[PDB]
Copies of this chain bind each other. A is one copy, B any other.
Amino acid sequence: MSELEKAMVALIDVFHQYSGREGDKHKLKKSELKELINNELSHFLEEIKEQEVVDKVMETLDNDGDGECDFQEFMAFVAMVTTACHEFFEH
């Protein structure tokens, strides 16, 4: 396993670490996504403390109107953030 391969299995992992807490085990509800951002992206994103902040993110990630974030939506989220971090590395 390459580092790349390992990083991918890591993403599957943390998504599930959180998506299995409540409700549908394969989707993130607002509470789970909040908990994820706050515990696993603490260094990359401002902490979410306000409900209105939660809504905007989920509203950003949720494309199929169900109000949850599935894995495909989460990958879109991971790319947003990683694309952010990467810009911090063009010189």
Give the oligomeric copy count. 2
Contact, CB under 8 Å: A79 / B72 = yes
By a beta-carbon cutoff of 8 Å, the part of chain A in contact with chain B is 1-16, 26, 36, 39-44, 71-72, 75-76, 78-79, 81-83, 85-86, 89-90
The interface residues of chain B lying within 8 Å CB-to-CB of A83 are: 71-72, 75
A71 to B82, CA, bound (A): 9
| Other-chain residue from B26, B40, B82 in contact with A3 (beta carbon distance below 8 A) | B40
The interface residues of chain B lying within 8 Å CB-to-CB of A89 are: 12, 16
The 7 sampled A-B contact pairs (Cβ below 8 Å) are A4-B78, A5-B44, A7-B8, A8-B78, A26-B90, A71-B83, A75-B83
